[PDB]
Amino acid sequence: KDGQYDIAFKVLKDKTEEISMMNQYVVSPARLTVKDGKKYIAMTLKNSEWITKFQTEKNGGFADAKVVSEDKAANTRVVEFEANDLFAKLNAKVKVDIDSMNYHHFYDVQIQFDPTKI
């Protein structure tokens, strides 16, 4: 049903049921927008300055999520991407850069939504 909803989720370490380090840097619940058969997720990233790339799987490939807003003062931003089956794991990729702590990596993670959770 068309509209905007809260949706809880967890970020999981690649190919596991373990909570990813990344989970610390996203806000749950996300906002799910349902619009004529399609589902979009708007998700807030914390420590935005550090997260230099964020991609999700779509059409067999990986695509940069759209940045729909940034809050420079809070150092957060909101990315938006499409989801299909809210009960299935969604593959994602993230690139992290922290110059001062010489931390420069990219990773694969899965996102797992839980439509039933409040």
8 vs 98, beta carbon nearer ligand HEM? 98
Do 75 and 102 contact (CB within 8 A), yes or no? no
Distance CA 12, CA 72 (A): 27
Distance separating alpha carbons of residues 28 and 118, to the nearest angstrom = 11
Binding of residue 111 to ligand HEM (CB under 6 A): no
105: contact with Zn ion by CB under 5 A: yes
Quick one: what does residue 86 bind among ligand HEM, Zn ion, none, with the CB cut-off 5 to 8 Å set by partner type? Answer: none
- What angle (nearest 5°) sits at the alpha carbon of residue 53, between those of residues 50 and 59? 155
Interaction between residue 13 and ligand HEM (CB under 6 A): yes
User: What residues pair up with 69 in beta bridges, in sequence order?
Assistant: 78
Residue from 28, 50, 86, 93 in contact with ligand HEM (CB under 6 A): 50
Residues that bind ligand HEM (CB under 6 A): 13, 20-22, 25, 47, 50-51, 94, 96, 98, 101, 103, 107, 109
